[PDB]
From a paper:
A close examination of the structure identified a methionine residue, M100, located at the entry of this cavity, which we surmised could be replaced with a bulkier residue to provide steric hindrance to block any incoming O2. Herein, we have rationally engineered a mutant yCD by replacing Met100 situated at the active site entry with the bulkier histidine to hinder potential oxidation of the active site Cys91. To obtain structural confirmation for this observation, we proceeded to determine the structure of yCD-M100H protein by X-ray crystallography. B Structure of a yCD-M100H active site consisting two Zn2+ ions, one of which is coordinated by the active site residues, His62, Cys91, and Cys94, as well as a presumed hydroxide which bridges to the second zinc whose remaining tetrahedral coordination is filled by water molecules. The histidine mutation does not affect the active site conformation nor the interaction of the catalytic Zn2+ ion with the active site ligands. In concurrence with our hypothesis, the histidine substitution indeed provides more coverage for the active site residue Cys91 along with the Zn2+ ion. The more rigid and bulkier side chain of histidine significantly reduces the solvent-accessible surface exposure area of Cys91, thereby protecting it from getting oxidized. The two enzymes share similar conformations except for the C-terminal helices, which are shifted away from the active site in yCD-M100H. Mutant yCD-M100H was significantly more active than its wild-type counterpart, exhibiting a much lower Km and higher kcat values than the wild-type’s. Furthermore, this amino acid substitution of methionine with histidine was able to enhance the yeast CD’s thermostability by 10 °C (Tm = 60.69 °C), which was comparable to that achieved by the triple mutant yCD-TM (Tm = 59.30 °C), whose mutations have also been reported to improve yCD’s thermostability.
Cytosine deaminases (CD) catalyze the hydrolytic deamination reaction of cytosine to uracil, and are found only in prokaryotes and fungi, but not mammalian cells. Utilization of yeast cytosine deaminase (yCD) to activate the prodrug 5-fluorocytosine (5-FC) to 5-fluorouracil (5-FU) at the target site is an attractive strategy for overcoming the narrow therapeutic index of 5-FU. Structural studies of yCD have shown that its active site contains a tightly bound zinc ion critical for catalytic activity, and is coordinated by His62 and two cysteine residues Cys91 and Cys94, and a hydroxyl group bridged to a second tetrahedrally coordinated zinc bound by three water molecules. Nevertheless, protein delivery of yCD is challenging in part due to its thermal instability.
Author numbering:
A (entry chain B), B (entry chain A): 7 to 158
């Protein structure tokens, strides 16, 4: 089940780092087919890049996969550098993506992490230090922007 | 509490009808400030228009409101022509939008409708037959497209 998890989190981290370089929030993701390891799409938070309230890393990832038949999502893993908010949790549930692998849940965690599990989805938190470090750097440099991004 | 609800559902329906005319799925929305009735944004499903897997009517509506401080969402109502999926439910929860007014829940309903309420959001289903009729027309004419849109 975990065969592609290093590949997936490496891509998600690359997306976070790219977003950071663009002036955005360093949250990245990708969607991988569990059978063959192919990458259906990858993305990062586009709040700053696009003035976007909805393009979280996870949402941008799914957008970048394009229109798909519903069946395609059912044997994928969504990789995200940060534990998903209620909206991104809802996307995973809506599309029936069975597995979500999370870089870290230290800098952010919503009720969504547990809700995924109650709705029958697998959540794996890998506690990736690279993810924790880049996210903490953003929180330390741009706390007001982070507060906007979390929507409180 | 319901002062702006006719206005809001009228705008949501206009957005659904516009989307229908553009060749898309007839689901529309708007976000209104509860105090003064001002429209923060309005939108419709953009699957066909933009090849979008994530721009549901509710998501498009929120995107069209732009970047906002989190406090702005806390005294709004989101109007949608159709009862929200788990992703759109999650967006409402994430941003703390206290009220969701729904055109109809006959053509579609998710576990989100009830989840909204247990998470502390008011859900009002007005059973607007304009919404029900246009949505059913789309489902009747384009069942394959509908199936794709709901992620099944
Ligand atoms: Zn997130
Ligand atoms: Zn999110
Ligand atoms: Zn919907
Ligand atoms: Zn939706």
């Amino acid at each position: 089940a975990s065969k592609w998890d290093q590949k997936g989190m490496d891509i998600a981290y690359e997306e976070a780092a790219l977003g950071y370089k663009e002036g955005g929030v360093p949250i990245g993701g990708c969607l991988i087919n569990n059978k063959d390891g192919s990458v259906l799409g990858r993305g990062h938070n586009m709040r700053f890049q696009k003035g976007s309230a909805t393009l979280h890393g996870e949402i941008s990832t799914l957008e970048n996969c394009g229109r798909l038949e519903g069946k395609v999502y059912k044997d994928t893993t969504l990789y995200t550098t940060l534990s998903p908010c209620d909206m991104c949790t809802g996307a995973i549930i809506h599309y029936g993506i069975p597995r979500c692998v999370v870089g870290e849940n230290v800098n952010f965690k919503s009720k969504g992490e547990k809700y995924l599990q109650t709705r029958g989805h697998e959540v794996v938190v890998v506690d990736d230090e690279r993810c924790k470090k880049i996210m903490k750097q953003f929180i330390d440099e741009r706390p007001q922007d982070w507060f906007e991004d979390i929507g409180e």
